[PDB]
Design a binder for this molecule. Structure first.
Ligand SMILES: *[C@@H]1O[C@H](CO)[C@@H](O)[C@H](O)[C@H]1NC(C)=O
Ligand SMILES: *[C@@H]1O[C@H](CO)[C@@H](O)[C@H](O)[C@H]1NC(C)=O
Ligand SMILES: *[C@@H]1O[C@H](CO)[C@@H](O)[C@H](O)[C@H]1NC(C)=O
Ligand SMILES: *[C@@H]1O[C@H](CO)[C@@H](O)[C@H](O)[C@H]1NC(C)=O
Ligand SMILES: *[C@@H]1O[C@H](CO)[C@@H](O)[C@H](O)[C@H]1NC(C)=O
Ligand SMILES: *[C@@H]1O[C@H](CO)[C@@H](O)[C@H](O)[C@H]1NC(C)=O
Ligand SMILES: *[C@@H]1O[C@H](CO)[C@@H](O)[C@H](O)[C@H]1NC(C)=O
Ligand SMILES: *[C@@H]1O[C@H](CO)[C@@H](O)[C@H](O)[C@H]1NC(C)=O
Ligand SMILES: *[C@@H]1O[C@H](CO)[C@@H](O)[C@H](O)[C@H]1NC(C)=O
Ligand SMILES: *[C@@H]1O[C@H](CO)[C@@H](O)[C@H](O)[C@H]1NC(C)=O
Ligand SMILES: *[C@@H]1O[C@H](CO)[C@@H](O)[C@H](O)[C@H]1NC(C)=O
Ligand SMILES: *[C@@H]1O[C@H](CO)[C@@H](O)[C@H](O)[C@H]1NC(C)=O
Ligand SMILES: [Cl-]
Ligand SMILES: [Cl-]
Ligand SMILES: [Cl-]
Ligand SMILES: [Cl-]
Ligand SMILES: [Cl-]
Ligand SMILES: [Cl-]
Ligand SMILES: [Cl-]
Ligand SMILES: [Cl-]
Ligand SMILES: [Cl-]
Ligand SMILES: [Cl-]
Ligand SMILES: [Cl-]
Ligand SMILES: [Cl-]
Ligand SMILES: [Cl-]
Ligand SMILES: [Cl-]
Ligand SMILES: [Cl-]
Ligand SMILES: [Cl-]
Ligand SMILES: [Cl-]
Ligand SMILES: [Cl-]
Ligand SMILES: [Cl-]
Ligand SMILES: [Cl-]
Ligand SMILES: [Cl-]
Ligand SMILES: [Cl-]
Ligand SMILES: [Cl-]
Ligand SMILES: [Cl-]
Ligand SMILES: [Cl-]
Ligand SMILES: [Cl-]
Ligand SMILES: [Cl-]
Ligand SMILES: [Cl-]
Ligand SMILES: [Cl-]
Ligand SMILES: [Cl-]
Ligand SMILES: [Cl-]
Ligand SMILES: [Cl-]
Ligand SMILES: [Cl-]
Ligand SMILES: [Cl-]
Ligand SMILES: [Cl-]
Ligand SMILES: [Cl-]
Ligand SMILES: [Cl-]
Ligand SMILES: [Cl-]
Ligand SMILES: [Cl-]
Ligand SMILES: [Cl-]
Ligand SMILES: [Cl-]
Ligand SMILES: [Cl-]
Ligand SMILES: [Cl-]
Ligand SMILES: [Cl-]
Ligand SMILES: [Cl-]
Ligand SMILES: [Cl-]
Lengths: 308, 317, 315, 313
């Protein structure tokens, strides 16, 4: 019954404790235990200690974005077995989340972790979140997409990873994401997508890969994407020589929608859209042609053969 | 001995035919060997259990356009050779007992349109594994519960237009793996659950026009691999970020579709979603709640929760 | 109506019951309470069951009509009885025939007693749609055949009683559909042969009675689908212990379950020997029905109708 | 820092051990890195959600032989690395909230015996796909609801003896396809549904002794293809017509079984059913001494089907 001074409390449609943008630097004491939704966003809260909301057993929505979170205790969400939506975004100094923090939240549907200065995704961080549908991880400081990071997320439909520093997509980065509809990887440092990286993405409808470091994309990697409707590939250093031939053909047959695929090399094809190129425009190796054998091994197969 | 108000003959099937004779009840003395009985266009109001009990070989029963107020739950129990049952155009019938069709394993067509039906009780279509045509249009249905058609694995046609169905839950159409044509137009459909059409891999025609769809998840169309024709006009489509998945689906789809006219935002009013470019679909156009012409920036976080996810993303950043 | 019929006793516990057995009733009594869940009319002298004889008793689950004087059952006798679970029509020896559509629509029927009803045949469609049926009693009738697909809808049937009839053989598809059958009683008939693959659908069968019949041989291959077999009775059959008995002999050696004795009727040298206890070398040559008649003097038509090993013999 | 009543050490696993210290509450200050906690033999009465919340890596929790009156539904929610949970010998616990074990997808053993349990609530064992050992013996259970163990695809041992289970319904043991050992002795089991053991194809050992079975359908034993040892003694077996299916099964079964002593009729008292001949099983021995001929058709409805046949002849 006693509502905290910084807060407004009401009962319909859900029991709500709302205290946003009140300059709070700590979670207010005396939050009604029957709260189903708690809005603490836009304050200056620095920490989330253990069991900060433990009495609110019926909590389904916890809003904590745009604070000054520097640390979240691994036991911060004790008691919140029914939590469905958790927004922790826009806390640029958070940097790290203990890998066990979200454990046991089997009702979680939405998790906002964007703009949290996250340096890495720890092992087990998203384990057990079988009901999760939306995962926001964009605009962090991620430098890797480790294998099996999303392995338990069989119900995930939306995965937002744009605006990090992801250098590549390993084979099993997206293992287990059989329900994924939308995958956004634009504005990273992706220089390559491993073969079979999209093996589990039979339901994917939308894939953004623009503003990355791709010089090539084997058509074979796109072949599991049988539900694909929309593909974005612009602003990549595409090399339109022999290595572009598979992607070129795939683009000709694909009935969905796609962006331009502008050539960056060779110079004679600069600013040409690959989709509009004739097959005979794709010749030789672009990369100076005589190289070290170790460097020759690092080039596409058609370049190694073009030397011969 | 043929009833006075009737005409009886034996080929091609034993038939008792007495339509539009102003009959106040089912006539007595219908030949027990009857296979086809045409009693439509009369003034019959009840069908007790004993009415057709002697007609063991009955396969076709026509009772449409009568004055049916009631059908006994045991009216057809022993008549399991029944193949076609037309009970339509009896507007005051209002309700059919959920056990009325149990055991009719040879039934192929069931007409229940224009019967003022208020609801489909649990188990109404249970066990009808041979049913091919089901007419339920122009009734007073206000709900399409999960598993209503669970056993209709052989149904090819399902008519549901002209009711007041407000939404399609996830398992409303579970089990309909033979369905070819599904007509849901002229209802109040405001939303379709993303996996509502999971079993409709053979569906060729789908009507959803004249409803209340502000958006349709492209995900719900994805299982419709046999789809050839899709009707979507006369819905209040919102052509903002929420329309992006459907927009892409419409570009790739090789079958035929109606226009998808944008209702909001105003700058895109009467534009066709099919003809829009991706860049046209940016941001959020608030089409729900009180204070109806409103900017997303003016909405609390709590208010944003009722909007599409992509609207929430647009408002915050 | 709600008052109890004169010849009856009515009570509510445990189920609403109308009980009028052995009252000398010649017809179904009027005024049986519509709320009846159970009706006992056995041991009277009821001569027929006309259309809708109990149609108001919508909650009826048990209808007892055995040991009456039924000469006819109207095809629509059981109108209204959608919830009927146990129907006992047994011991009406002058009934002779049931209209093939009489039980149609009785989807809750679990038990059906039709034994000792003088039944001359099982009409096409007689047991159609009885998906819940578990017990079917057909013993001590006058059945002269088991037509194909007679039981094809009886997927939940566990007990089938057919003894004391005049069934002459078991055709290939007689028992199609009986995937749940546990006990099959076929004794005291005239079974001269069991068609190969006749037991194809009886993988759950635990008990098979074939004694007091006219079997001269049983291919071991016909028993092979019976993976659940526990008990097999085969006595009182004119078993012929020649070359034709070799497969059954081998089967009996390996069989881990229980079986009766299998007494040899021919040849005379092995008369009344138990096939189970014979050595394989005791099984030789071919003994035709018949002084023993040689294969050598037989017609080719007759020869073709003998077991394969007999045809091979003397050839 | 190790709590005064405890001993703490690192190898082989980080362990906090404080058993039999007369503790009335879970000690505060248990090291967060604890993988194993031994608090058995104390007098602990409550387990609030906060108790073990900081022990994120907790794998083994021993709480047996305490005074538990209550376990909070959120007591283990975040501790999803739990593999062994021993809550046994807390006779006043009586109820475990149906959500208590949700999300424990690494749980391998769960001890709930001697907890005075009155019921198993819906969803109590939901999602425990890793569970191998489940102890539920010596409680106060009066029913085994359908689908109680539906998700326990990896369960090998299930102990249910010493309860008051009156019957086994058709789908009580649905889902238990890895089950090796099932102990149901010392209950009140009067009947087992014919298809109750449908999913128990790997079952090797079945204890049904000290119950109230007057008969057991052979049909229920048929799917038990791996069965090796069956205990059936100390039941009031009726060796009349209703025993014929079990009689035959007993003749064919090549694993081991206890004696199956007849309780009725008097002429076969204390005889082993396994040793009887088929001719010894005839007619109906009515539980009362009442003749079969004297029985009304109404009364016969509550008897085995073969008794109805033996009565009417
Ligand atoms: C949660 O909701 C339930 C059901 O309305 C209620 O009984 C319970 O008291 C609530 N819990 C809290 C902590 O308010
Ligand atoms: C995932 O979504 C499906 C519906 O698509 C739902 O039935 C299921 O309960 C959800 N959760 C899990 C763990 O499958
Ligand atoms: C990736 O591309 C950016 C331009 O968008 C460039 O500045 C950067 O050096 C590239 N990095 C690598 C590793 O190629
Ligand atoms: C129904 O059809 C069967 C077979 O054609 C026939 O024997 C019977 O007389 C017909 N009529 C009735 C009322 O059963
Ligand atoms: C469905 O229809 C086909 C022919 O259209 C038929 O062969 C099949 O038996 C029907 N299925 C059922 C379950 O009756
Ligand atoms: C649906 O739209 C029609 C016209 O477009 C309107 O008359 C009706 O009120 C709407 N229904 C709902 C529930 O908003
Ligand atoms: C059958 O039982 C139902 C519910 O017990 C009752 O409402 C109904 O009146 C009964 N029918 C008759 C004919 O008594
Ligand atoms: C047949 O038996 C199965 C197994 O007990 C049961 O689930 C099913 O409901 C039964 N069928 C009918 C029609 O009663
Ligand atoms: C059937 O067996 C009996 C044995 O009592 C025998 O009398 C009868 O002739 C046999 N029937 C045939 C057709 O051989
Ligand atoms: C759990 O173990 C990991 C190492 O696997 C360690 O980094 C972490 O600090 C441990 N957690 C606690 C609360 O001790
Ligand atoms: C079940 O057991 C198998 C074999 O021991 C194992 O591979 C599997 O991981 C187990 N399941 C779980 C959920 O641990
Ligand atoms: C079996 O039931 C009887 C009374 O019905 C009871 O005395 C006996 O203790 C029961 N058996 C067991 C093992 O509890
Ligand atoms: Cl609440
Ligand atoms: Cl804010
Ligand atoms: Cl903290
Ligand atoms: Cl959500
Ligand atoms: Cl993104
Ligand atoms: Cl999408
Ligand atoms: Cl390729
Ligand atoms: Cl792009
Ligand atoms: Cl170009
Ligand atoms: Cl290449
Ligand atoms: Cl070359
Ligand atoms: Cl008309
Ligand atoms: Cl009128
Ligand atoms: Cl009526
Ligand atoms: Cl329609
Ligand atoms: Cl069509
Ligand atoms: Cl979608
Ligand atoms: Cl349209
Ligand atoms: Cl149009
Ligand atoms: Cl506008
Ligand atoms: Cl347009
Ligand atoms: Cl964003
Ligand atoms: Cl009698
Ligand atoms: Cl009659
Ligand atoms: Cl029999
Ligand atoms: Cl049996
Ligand atoms: Cl034959
Ligand atoms: Cl053979
Ligand atoms: Cl025998
Ligand atoms: Cl001889
Ligand atoms: Cl001998
Ligand atoms: Cl042969
Ligand atoms: Cl140590
Ligand atoms: Cl102890
Ligand atoms: Cl351990
Ligand atoms: Cl023990
Ligand atoms: Cl035990
Ligand atoms: Cl049995
Ligand atoms: Cl024992
Ligand atoms: Cl065995
Ligand atoms: Cl066995
Ligand atoms: Cl003995
Ligand atoms: Cl008894
Ligand atoms: Cl009696
Ligand atoms: Cl029995
Ligand atoms: Cl008998």
């Amino acid at each position: 019954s006693p509502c905290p001074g910084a807060c407004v409390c009401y009962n319909e449609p859900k029991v709500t404790t709302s205290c946003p943008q009140q300059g709070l630097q700590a979670v207010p004491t005396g939050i009604p235990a029957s709260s189903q939704r708690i809005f603490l966003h836009g304050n200056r809260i620095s920490h989330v200690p253990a069991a900060s909301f433990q009495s609110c057993r019926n909590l389904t929505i916890l809003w904590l974005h745009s604070n000054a979170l520097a640390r979240i205790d691994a036991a911060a969400f004790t008691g919140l077995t029914l939590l469905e939506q958790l927004d922790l975004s826009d806390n640029a100094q958070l940097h790290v989340v203990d890998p066990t923090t979200f454990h046991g939240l089997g009702h979680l549907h939405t998790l906002h972790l964007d703009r949290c200065g996250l340096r890495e995704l720890g092992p087990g961080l998203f384990r057990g979140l079988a009901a999760l549908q939306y995962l926001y991880l964009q605009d962090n400081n991620l430098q890797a997409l480790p294998d099996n990071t999303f392995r338990d997320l069989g119900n995930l439909t939306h995965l937002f990873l744009h605006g990090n520093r992801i250098p590549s997509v390993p084979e099993h980065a997206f293992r287990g994401l059989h329900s994924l509809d939308r995958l956004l990887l634009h504005q990273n440092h992706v220089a390559r997508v491993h073969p079979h990286a999209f093996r589990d993405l039979g339901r994917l409808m939308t894939l953004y890969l623009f503003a990355n470091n791709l010089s090539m994309l084997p058509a074979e990697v796109l072949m599991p994407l049988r539900s694909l409707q929309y593909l974005r590939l612009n602003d990549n250093p595409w090399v339109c020589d022999c290595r572009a031939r598979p992607l070129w053909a795939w683009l000709q047959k694909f009935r969905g929608s796609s962006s331009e695929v502008p050539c960056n090399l060779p110079q004679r094809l600069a600013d040409r859209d690959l989709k509009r190129l004739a097959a005979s425009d794709l010749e030789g190796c672009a990369v100076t042609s005589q190289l070290t054998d170790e460097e020759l091994l690092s080039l596409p197969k058609c370049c190694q053969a073009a030397a011969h």
